[PDB]
Design a protein around this nucleic acid. Structure first.
Ligand SMILES: [Mg+2]
Ligand SMILES: [Mg+2]
Ligand SMILES: [Mg+2]
Ligand SMILES: [Mg+2]
Ligand SMILES: [Mg+2]
Ligand SMILES: [Mg+2]
Ligand SMILES: [Mg+2]
Ligand SMILES: [Mg+2]
Ligand SMILES: [Mg+2]
Ligand SMILES: [Mg+2]
Ligand SMILES: [Mg+2]
Ligand SMILES: [Mg+2]
Ligand SMILES: [Mg+2]
Ligand SMILES: [Mg+2]
Ligand SMILES: [Mg+2]
Ligand SMILES: [Mg+2]
Ligand SMILES: [Mg+2]
Ligand SMILES: [Mg+2]
Ligand SMILES: [Mg+2]
Ligand SMILES: [Mg+2]
Ligand SMILES: [Mg+2]
Ligand SMILES: [Mg+2]
Ligand SMILES: [Mg+2]
Ligand SMILES: [Mg+2]
Ligand SMILES: [Mg+2]
Ligand SMILES: [Mg+2]
Ligand SMILES: [Mg+2]
Ligand SMILES: [Mg+2]
Ligand SMILES: [Mg+2]
Ligand SMILES: [Mg+2]
Ligand SMILES: [Mg+2]
Ligand SMILES: [Mg+2]
Ligand SMILES: [Mg+2]
Ligand SMILES: [Mg+2]
Ligand SMILES: [Mg+2]
Ligand SMILES: [Mg+2]
Ligand SMILES: [Mg+2]
Ligand SMILES: [Mg+2]
Ligand SMILES: [Mg+2]
Ligand SMILES: [Mg+2]
Ligand SMILES: [Mg+2]
Ligand SMILES: [Mg+2]
Ligand SMILES: [Mg+2]
Ligand SMILES: [Mg+2]
Ligand SMILES: [Mg+2]
Ligand SMILES: [Mg+2]
Ligand SMILES: [Mg+2]
Ligand SMILES: [Mg+2]
Ligand SMILES: [Mg+2]
Lengths: 77, 45, 66, 181, 141, 111
RNA sequence: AAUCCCCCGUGCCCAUAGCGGCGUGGAACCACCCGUUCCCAUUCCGAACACGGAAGUGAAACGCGCCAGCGCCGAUGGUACUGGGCGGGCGACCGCCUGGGAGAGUAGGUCGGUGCGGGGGA
RNA sequence: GCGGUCGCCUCCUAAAAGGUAACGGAGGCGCCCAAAGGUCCCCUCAGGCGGGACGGAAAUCCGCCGGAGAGCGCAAGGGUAGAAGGGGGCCUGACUGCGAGGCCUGCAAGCCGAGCAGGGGCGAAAGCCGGGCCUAGUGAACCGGUGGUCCCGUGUGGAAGG
RNA sequence: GCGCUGACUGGGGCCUGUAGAGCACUGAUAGGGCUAGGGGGCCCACCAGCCUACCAAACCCUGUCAAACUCCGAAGGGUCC
RNA sequence: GGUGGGGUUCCCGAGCGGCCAAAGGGAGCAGACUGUAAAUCUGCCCGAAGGUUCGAAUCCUUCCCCCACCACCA
RNA sequence: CGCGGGGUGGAGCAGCCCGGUAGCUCGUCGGGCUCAUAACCCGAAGGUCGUCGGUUCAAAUCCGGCCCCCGCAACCA
RNA sequence: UUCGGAUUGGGGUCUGCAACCCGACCCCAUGAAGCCGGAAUCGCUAGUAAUCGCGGAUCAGCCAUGCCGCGGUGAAUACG
């Protein structure tokens, strides 16, 4: 017999809205494990590091080098 | 050790968690009741 | 320095086999000292007292004539 | 207490002989004494803090500063020592009080060391500071020998602004440090 | 018998034999070499059957370089087969060898001497080979 | 030694500010002088400036400071500006910086 | 006002801005620096943090330059691989078409650029 | 049959969204912390080399070099010093009443959540605070216990029992 | 019932870590040099102590390997306009 | 969850309202006897807080554990 | 292959649960008594815990592998 | 420890052809174990035991604390 045999549930992680999608206040934007997308303008980040639109708007991505990747919501939806 | 916090009178309040023998003491800390507002809140039972 | 619980450090007087060390500046003023060197006892301005160099030498000398 | 003979002796004897020897272009470039840090590893006292506090009482008496306490960085089992226990005492001193302490150290302390053919001159650490250990604590004038429960030594660290070793030597030489040549 | 000391995982997946490639391939250490024509798992007990063929031909002389190494664990099911329960039981090790790679590669021996050794050495191998010399093309580096 | 306590604590106190997204009232105190800008980030643009340098004053820098404080309100409040966030940068909020701040009232408020 | 150059802030690009070596700056700014009465301070130390200063030095720090030893960036050609279409081999695997096309490596490149506001020069 | 296994977390398998199987490869959980929690203020590692009494490969001390390989209570992963790490001070938001809008998803669950109100905490303020860097530390309903409260009380008031 | 929103296709953004490849990390790993530790062969037994045609840290030249390695990273795939 | 017993010097163990270094046993130490080993013999040495009285190891409240027992488990 | 138990001074056994200081009997060694030996008496020495990794501050002790050992199993076919 | 004098450094005296191995002695320095000894075991019944010194023999000198003698002071206890 085998002492192996487990695995855990898929956590269905990753990005839930991409650039230039129209979001709404509260929409969550990224589901993620560490801080690998840091919150930008109008983007909150919850205790599971999870990012959500603060305002209705549209989503843009920004790659700031050693500063990291950033998700902003650009208002006036 | 499951934990249950009384306060003074009217006895409704809220409950808690203590997994330790510290504090072994009367275990009392400040909190908000549903009727009056923010009283002493000791621990019973 | 923090105020309270700290030693005074007051100008003092130190003595020795020599005269006084005027400088001092330490807690517990007027202290006595066993031997201070830099007034040149003890190997500074070395006297080299009760020196020997006689280990080979002694049996080289009295044994010379005898 | 801004007089301090050794301090003066640095400015009106040592600084000049220094420029004459190494030929320094700038006023600042010539070696200064910053920071004599004294330290006792006391781990001889682990579970007894009573032994520690008597020893910090001792330093303050010779230094004129109440020392810090150093605490175990990591737990290392082979000799006792769990993490965070008091290890020993450490006091930083500068600026006057380093002077007044070094003065006493040269005229009184070191003369009172058994043997003492002079200070080993390899302890310059090569970036030009010097370090020395002491066996007992009663070689200082402030200690009365009837106050000692047990003899515990220390580590003295002296930091120079001298970029090099040979320079740092000169400074301390000319200050009157009895090197073993 | 070559075999890694201190492995990180015993038992790794089989994976494919595709794409003849990836370094080795240019004869860096010696005067002549054995190059793989076809892909294979080549077994530690195969590599040493090649090594010894050659040192025997040099009468303990020469220099021999190997240059493939069996780091891939080979499992097997005991006899007693039945599919399941687990995976089980590493036998040997193999090195994966795709085409154009130099294994072996002698030096410090006369040409016709080494070329005879490499030919012997080749028969101990499951795939086809080519013997080679060394080149401008094997550059400088 | 990479990236000193100075420049950490500096970032640490700045980054928090830049989050709430107000106008930033930045404060540079030097050994002689004390200067203050009011900055709009995302336009990357200074709006209203004040200093002991440009107002050519001296006499006891904590008192000088409060003056470049009242000086900044004045100039700034004039453009519509109210509600900023007080930088304080590497400085403990204390002394000269506390004073430019606590003289930066009557406009540019909440500190 | 503008254009320029130098400094001080403060952003942006996020190493082509970095390490190292050399050189250079104190009028002004900035630093170190002068003190520790006062505010406020260091599990000890005005080191730091803080205040009052202004004699000195640009030694340290910083700013500006120069050098390609390092670091970093890096083609073009060519391959690998491959979306779609076809073949071949007992097999492991291979090949052709059409479109896309790396990685390493070679040539090289670089000792930053730039915005807003100050102070100073013209 | 015997043996193993049965829920939960991490990684790979998994074919660069998600998801994805096997008696495929490996590991972990059924706790824990009144500080290991909130906040404000500071502080920055491991390691290497040189120096230094008892001190040794490593107790503490000093110098330089070290961009994160250390630490983050525990497995792994992701994350992370421009702190999530270490220290200190005041503190109990490990609040009550709610909850736009979404992640996920057969159902039922699981999850994140701005914002308003009450009364607070820390902070000069901006602000943060509805436990803990995060992802495991769990159990529908039914039946019953205990505390409270307004609700019902079999003609009526009580009481029994809900 | 709605009624142009559909599959597929064009353009544009964003997302990803596989094929390939790489060795910067985690490990594995061939040849050489230089070197701690050491087997030792031994010079002493006091610190000493020369040599390695054995191990083998680090380090440098050369050369590779990896589902649970990645300094890199296609084609494609997903999603919104 | 309930009931009943407890808790004493190193172990056990009796423990009483007029103090009980607190019976006793064995353990340990030092003596006596000794083929060995002993047996015999002599000396040495109040769970907790609070509370009632003049006095608490004794009576009560409380708290902590032990032993015992009965009962229940959605 | 399967499952359960084990491996520790010269022998035979504790200790492993529950991490931190390895114990018991015999044996061995030095002495005593005897004319002498044995019995008996007074002293002493001796093990790194099968082995290799790992966990932790610390491993005989907890985890994994390999190695020997003892027991049970292998049925319907 | 002013107990005790083992070890060891240095300095010398004497016998002797000669004191390295291996002499005795003097002086200065050094001061160790040892705080009354496990199981066991020895002597002694009186001027004995204990204790204290002195002499001879051999012998150049001496490793003699041995041996053979001398006197000095001088116990305890034998139920059986
Ligand atoms: Mg998974
Ligand atoms: Mg220096
Ligand atoms: Mg190849
Ligand atoms: Mg062949
Ligand atoms: Mg100047
Ligand atoms: Mg000048
Ligand atoms: Mg004062
Ligand atoms: Mg302090
Ligand atoms: Mg300079
Ligand atoms: Mg390139
Ligand atoms: Mg190309
Ligand atoms: Mg194609
Ligand atoms: Mg390229
Ligand atoms: Mg700029
Ligand atoms: Mg079964
Ligand atoms: Mg996927
Ligand atoms: Mg896919
Ligand atoms: Mg399990
Ligand atoms: Mg270090
Ligand atoms: Mg060191
Ligand atoms: Mg890490
Ligand atoms: Mg705190
Ligand atoms: Mg909802
Ligand atoms: Mg509120
Ligand atoms: Mg039912
Ligand atoms: Mg019910
Ligand atoms: Mg109601
Ligand atoms: Mg009613
Ligand atoms: Mg009725
Ligand atoms: Mg009724
Ligand atoms: Mg249409
Ligand atoms: Mg469509
Ligand atoms: Mg399209
Ligand atoms: Mg691959
Ligand atoms: Mg590698
Ligand atoms: Mg891969
Ligand atoms: Mg690239
Ligand atoms: Mg697209
Ligand atoms: Mg007997
Ligand atoms: Mg015997
Ligand atoms: Mg016998
Ligand atoms: Mg270990
Ligand atoms: Mg049957
Ligand atoms: Mg002799
Ligand atoms: Mg005595
Ligand atoms: Mg005797
Ligand atoms: Mg007789
Ligand atoms: Mg006598
Ligand atoms: Mg005699």
């Amino acid at each position: 017999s085998t002492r192996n045999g487990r695995d855990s549930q898929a956590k269905r992680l990753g990005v839930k809205r991409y650039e230039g999608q129209v979001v709404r206040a509260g929409n969550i934007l990224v589901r993620q494990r560490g801080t690998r997308f840091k919150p930008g303008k109008n983007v909150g980040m919850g205790r599971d590091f999870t990012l959500f639109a603060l305002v209705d708007g549209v989503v843009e991505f920004q790659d700031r080098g050693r500063l990291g990747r950033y998700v902003h919501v650009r208002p006036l939806a | 050790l499951l934990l249950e916090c009384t306060e003074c009178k009217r006895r409704n309040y809220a409950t808690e968690k203590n997994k330790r023998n510290t504090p072994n003491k009367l275990e009392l800390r400040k909190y908000c009741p549903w009727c009056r507002k923010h009283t002493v809140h000791r621990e019973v039972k | 320095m923090k105020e309270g619980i700290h030693p005074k450090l007051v100008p003092a007087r130190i003595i020795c086999g020599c005269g006084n060390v005027i400088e001092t500046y330490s807690t517990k003023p007027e202290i006595y000292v066993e031997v201070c060197s830099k007034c040149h006892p003890f190997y500074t301005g070395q006297q080299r007292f009760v020196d020997t160099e006689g280990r080979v030498e002694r049996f080289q000398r009295r044994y010379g004539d005898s | 207490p801004l007089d301090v003979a050794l301090k003066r002796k640095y400015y009106e004897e040592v600084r000049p002989e220094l420029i004459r020897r190494f030929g320094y272009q700038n006023v600042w470039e010539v070696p200064r004494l910053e920071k004599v840090v004294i330290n006792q590893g006391l781990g001889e006292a682990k579970e007894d803090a009573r032994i520690l506090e008597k020893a910090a009482q001792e330093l303050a008496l010779i230094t004129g500063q109440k020392p810090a306490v150093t605490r175990a960085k990591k737990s290392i089992s082979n000799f006792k020592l769990r993490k965070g226990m008091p290890i020993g005492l450490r006091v930083t001193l500068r600026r006057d009080r380093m002077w007044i302490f070094l003065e006493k150290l040269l005229n009184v302390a070191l003369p009172r060391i058994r043997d003492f053919r002079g200070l080993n001159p390899n302890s310059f650490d090569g970036r030009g500071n010097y370090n020395l250990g002491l066996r007992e604590q009663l070689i200082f004038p402030e200690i009365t020998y009837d106050m000692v429960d047990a003899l515990r030594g220390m580590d003295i660290a002296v930091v120079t602004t001298a970029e090099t070793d040979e320079e740092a030597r000169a400074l301390l030489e000319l200050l009157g440090f009895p090197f073993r040549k | 018998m070559l075999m890694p000391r201190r492995m990180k995982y015993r038992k790794q997946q089989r994976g494919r034999l595709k794409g003849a490639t990836k370094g080795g391939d240019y004869v860096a250490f010696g005067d002549y070499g054995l190059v793989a024509l076809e892909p294979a798992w080549i077994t530690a007990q195969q590599i040493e059957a090649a090594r010894v063929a050659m040192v025997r031909h040099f009468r303990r002389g020469g220099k021999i370089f190997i240059r493939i190494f069996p780091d891939k664990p080979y499992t097997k099911k005991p006899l007693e087969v039945r599919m399941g329960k687990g995976k089980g039981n590493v036998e040997g090790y193999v090195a994966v060898v795709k085409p154009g790679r130099v294994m072996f590669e002698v030096a410090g021996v006369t040409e016709e001497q080494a070329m005879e050794a490499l030919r012997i050495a080749g028969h101990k191998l499951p795939i086809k080979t080519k013997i080679v010399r060394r080149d401008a093309y094997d550059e400088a580096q | 030694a990479r990236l000193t306590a100075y420049e950490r604590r500096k970032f640490r106190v700045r980054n928090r500010i830049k989050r709430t997204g107000r106008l930033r009232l930045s404060v540079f105190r030097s050994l002689k002088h004390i200067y203050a800008q009011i900055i709009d980030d995302e336009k990357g643009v200074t709006l209203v400036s004040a200093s002991s340098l440009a107002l050519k004053l001296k006499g006891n820098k904590t008192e000088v400071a409060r003056q470049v404080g009242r000086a900044l309100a004045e100039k700034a409040l004039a453009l519509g500006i109210k509600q900023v966030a007080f930088d304080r940068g590497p400085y403990k909020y204390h002394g000269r910086v506390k004073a430019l701040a606590e003289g930066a009232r009557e406009g540019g408020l909440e500190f």
